Design a protein around this ligand. Structure first.
Ligand SMILES: CNc1ccc(N(Cc2ccsc2)C(=O)Cn2nnc3ccccc32)cc1
Ligand SMILES: CNc1ccc(N(Cc2ccsc2)C(=O)Cn2nnc3ccccc32)cc1
Lengths: 304, 304
């Protein structure tokens, strides 16, 4: 028992991290097979970030201008190209540590682990969720760009995020591994405000199920509700509308605990309406929304 | 910016995890050089755990009874011995993935990362603190025994914890890598209750400094206090007494923010006395105590 904000083991990703330098800018890259992926803003100075013309800036760069170092060994760059907001640097050596991998574009509400890196070296790992406004609440400092988000299915690493920027709000924006930004964000130092950060209702319910499994049951009540009634309450509290798909995904958690999904919705409704009254659930004094139903089952079963 | 419960990158430890089986019991082991470390209760059945005589149980075991598998390859066991509550299995092959490492016995209040494992395979990583009552609040299921806690100083892995048991309270107990339990716990399925779980005051203050660095400053007030006055309040709230050593360790955080340690103590005093009034600090609605002052500096500087 016990429930923690657990990240995937980061070893398979640590073996892919490299340092990429272009001119005076150094950030992280992801070396998979014979390609190194990195944010295209590596070709910019801080002066360029106000209104960069990436196609024009890239014309002034040749293969030899991209310095790629894997630990202490220099990779030879034999090609470069821009795909959306990422640069793909073809190198002459396939990464011997390349794991089985996929590039996936995740949905808002889905979770992933981030291996924060600086100068191609890993500093730490933590679990994230793609917010419904397509930002992530990470922990990134200057030089962390190119750090990636991923999930792991036994031996396969699904890369879903590459860090590009911190919004003036202190929240983070980035792309999938095809270089497409999540949300409306652009790689320009401009006024970009994130939309309403709604709470991921299906994840809060999954976390309530995790709480019941792990012994925290004080919040269970004698009530039930309907999807429409629950959603009137979810709207008032800036919670995502709950759908039948969400109820279906909570099915295994419902079956394991014997608590019908709508009954858990009624517990959640009372918690929204009455607050925690100074009490805690799984060591938290707020409703946690960064565990998916899949995460709860994975953690409560012991998948390796 | 942003502040997260960050774990160390787990790659160097993932390369050490193996599966150890003795009879019908399978748990995790730690392979470093030519030795595999694991909990001695691997020699027990659940029947034995009520009152085990480990020396007597071990006499019935030979080197060939300890099955050690590293991924899919079997290690040859050429020696075995019991050191306190751990077994050390001498194998004929040095682990090629052995990192630079040390065995350290940590102090209560200190933090570490845990790589939860099952059947020698890693499932996830999370950040912990050794509680002042010498328990850890982890996420462990049956088969997780032998999973280890560690810290990393650039290339050196300091192993500090090996998981042994879950107390009837849902909290966790284990040993250092010399097999000595943290706290008064014994590897016997018996009545063992943890003492008072006090809050790690120096860590809460470190986290308040992290909050100010990252922009959450609402809790700063116009007051100051003294160590003796603060400690009268800390006692009332089951917080650890703050010492001059703790103030000294907070020195760098104080210098960086310009907020004197006793002034932060006065903010903490008001937060203890008045609560958060429905507000949050670094996304938490309670006072976080599982970041040391070293953790805050490390995360806020970008150490790899
Ligand atoms: C020289 N090149 C350069 C490139 C990028 C940045 N910017 C601004 C920006 C605008 C549009 S895309 C990126 C970043 O946001 C970087 N970054 N990322 N995460 C960060 C956390 C803390 C501090 C900085 C961080 C700055 C300089
Ligand atoms: C057959 N051998 C055996 C050995 C140990 C255990 N016990 C009881 C126990 C008493 C004294 S030392 C250990 C554990 O506590 C194992 N364990 N650890 N973390 C756990 C989380 C969830 C469930 C079980 C967990 C049980 C069986």
């Amino acid at each position: 028992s016990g429930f923690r904000k657990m990240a995937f083991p980061s070893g398979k990703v640590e073996g892919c991290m490299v340092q990429v330098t272009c001119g005076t800018t150094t950030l992280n890259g992801l070396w998979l097979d014979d390609v190194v992926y990195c944010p295209r803003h590596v070709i910019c100075t801080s002066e360029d970030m106000l209104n960069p013309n990436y196609e024009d800036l890239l014309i002034r760069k040749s293969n030899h201008n991209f310095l790629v170092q894997a630990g202490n060994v220099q990779l030879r760059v034999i090609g470069h190209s821009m795909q959306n907001c990422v640069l793909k640097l073809k190198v002459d050596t396939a990464n011997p540590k390349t794991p089985k991998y996929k590039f996936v574009r995740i949905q808002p509400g889905q979770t992933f682990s981030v291996l924060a890196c600086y100068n191609g070296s890993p500093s730490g790992v933590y679990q994230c969720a793609m917010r419904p406004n397509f930002t992530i609440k990470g922990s990134f400092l200057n030089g962390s760009c190119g750090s990636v988000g991923f999930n792991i299915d036994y031996d396969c690493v699904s890369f879903c995020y590459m860090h590009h920027m911190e919004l003036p709000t202190g929240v983070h924006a980035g792309t999938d591994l095809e270089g497409n930004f999540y949300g409306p964000f652009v790689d320009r130092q401009t006024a970009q405000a994130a939309g309403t950060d709604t709470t991921i209702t299906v994840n809060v319910l999954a976390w309530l199920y995790a709480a019941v499994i792990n012994g925290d049951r004080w919040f269970l009540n004698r009530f039930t509700t309907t999807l429409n009634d629950f959603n009137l309450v979810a709207m008032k509290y800036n919670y995502e509308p709950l759908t039948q798909d969400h109820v279906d995904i909570l099915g295994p958690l419902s079956a394991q605990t014997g608590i019908a999904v709508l009954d858990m919705c009624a517990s959640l409704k009372e918690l929204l309406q009455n607050g925690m009254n100074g009490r805690t659930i799984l060591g938290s004094a707020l409703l946690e929304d960064e565990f998916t139903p899949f995460d709860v089952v994975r953690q409560c079963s012991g998948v390796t």
